């Protein structure tokens, strides 16, 4: 009864907020940014994207080295080492390069959008900005949000490119697989307009829900540096619940 009603109130308040973040989101994009916006916009790419680049190559190199390592050894027993190039491509492209690219991005830059705005909340460096007079929704939010949208499809292609080229390195350089059957296994089965293009349309709505939460949950948080970490998980928790919760609608609309 007591704790139950407590949790109820909790859920209600949470849902109420969420809605808010919607009311924030229109107010950022439905205004034309001024001069000086692009200069911070480049620096946010310098902050979010270029710093995120060194990570996803290594985890890109890894997963191809694993996925072409183990399925083949069971698959070679019947007749197929030529379908190695298909199974590495069609599971990275339509399944993992949307999903696992974001969970490394929600890791690095899904935090550093919150704690950089959890920065300006504790020392009132948000409040001073309003008091001098800017609006941080134009100043420190909108160049942050517009880099977050752009830079993730700019990475998840980069990710899967080394993802496939990684699995080539285990195949032809150590397992001795035929090069021609490797690539022409892919060429026949991986169309462009149905897989790589629809691997992007997954990665855009995986970029919006990951970066809009990580902006809002750093803005409307109380400046307590304990709860700056409980606000930190609600970036990651609500991202990973929704970046996985909206794969299953996006897999069904594309195919099935």
């Amino acid at each position: 009864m007591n704790t139950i009603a407590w949790l109820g109130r909790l859920v209600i308040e949470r849902i109420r907020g969420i809605g808010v973040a919607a009311l924030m989101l229109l107010q950022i994009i439905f205004s034309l940014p001024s001069a000086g916006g692009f200069g911070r916009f480049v620096y946010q790419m310098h902050r979010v994207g270029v710093m995120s680049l060194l990570i996803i190559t290594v985890s890109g190199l890894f997963i191809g080295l694993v996925l072409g390592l183990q399925g083949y050894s069971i698959l070679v027993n019947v007749g197929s080492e030529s379908m190695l190039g298909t199974m590495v491509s069609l599971t990275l492209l339509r399944e993992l390069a949307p999903v696992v690219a974001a969970l490394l991005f929600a890791g690095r830059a899904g935090s550093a959008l919150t704690a950089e705005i959890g920065s300006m909340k504790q020392s009132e460096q948000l409040a001073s900005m309003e008091m001098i007079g800017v609006d941080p929704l134009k100043q420190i939010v909108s160049p942050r949000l517009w880099a977050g949208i752009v830079s993730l499809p700019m990475l998840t292609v980069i990710f899967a490119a080394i993802g496939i080229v990684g699995g080539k390195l285990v195949g032809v350089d150590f397992l001795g697989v035929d090069e021609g059957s490797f690539w022409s296994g892919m060429q026949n089965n991986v169309q462009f307009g149905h897989d790589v293009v629809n691997g992007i349309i997954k990665s855009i709505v995986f970029a919006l829900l990951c970066t809009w939460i990580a902006v809002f949950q750093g803005y409307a948080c109380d400046p307590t540096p304990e709860g700056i970490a409980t606000a930190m998980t609600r970036t990651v928790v609500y991202s990973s619940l929704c970046v996985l919760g909206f794969d299953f609608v996006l897999t069904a609309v594309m195919f099935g």
Partner: protein, 191 residues
């Protein structure tokens, strides 16, 4: 205006599940992607490895699913429940005009039209009014069988036409069935 954010916070979260069920149309688990589908049944003797949500083809065009597979131990036969997508196994204004004039001239020819009742004016409209009420495409001696999808595929109902002269409505039962093929008896009966 503190309830407004709250109201939009409901307005989004009920909308997100609504589109989430909108993807549950075309995904194919729940619901059917069939425009005015209609059920038919058939009775086999061997439905080995034939799952629900199977494929039903005419010559290679997938025109149906499989809903339930039932037995009846008093006769020890299988009974398959399936619906067909019909706007392309069902006729329309061109073909209904085509088939009505076809069978009344061919099946009801001088072997059949000049061996009949006294007034050949009411029965001529009887052959056409017995056909408008949801005729499908499948003749009187078309057979249904179980294929194997290539060499190592998975089983699916193959509807094969036999040409025939009379068709069957939405609710009937195909009377020319045969079960699957099996390598157990065949290698014994070959060696």
């Amino acid at each position: 205006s503190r309830t407004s954010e709250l109201a939009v916070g409901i307005f989004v979260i009920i909308f997100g599940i609504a589109l989430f069920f909108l993807a549950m149309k075309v995904s194919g688990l729940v619901g059917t992607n069939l425009s005015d589908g209609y059920t038919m049944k058939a009775q086999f003797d061997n439905v080995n490895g034939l799952k629900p949500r199977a494929k039903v083809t005419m010559s290679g065009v997938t025109i149906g699913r499989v809903d339930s597979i039932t037995l009846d131990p008093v006769t020890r036969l299988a009974t398959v429940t399936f619906d067909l997508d019909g706007k392309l196994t069902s006729f329309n204004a061109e073909q209904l005009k085509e088939v009505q004039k076809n069978a009344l001239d061919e099946l009801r020819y001088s072997s059949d039209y000049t061996q009949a009742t006294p007034a050949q004016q009411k029965t001529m409209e009887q052959q056409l009014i017995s056909n408008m009420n949801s005729i499908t495409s499948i003749d009187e001696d078309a057979y249904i069988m179980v294929a194997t999808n290539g060499l190592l595929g998975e089983k699916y109902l193959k509807i094969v036409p036999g040409g025939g002269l009379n068709y069957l409505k939405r609710g009937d039962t195909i009377s020319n069935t045969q079960g699957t093929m099996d390598l157990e008896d065949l290698i014994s009966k070959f060696i």
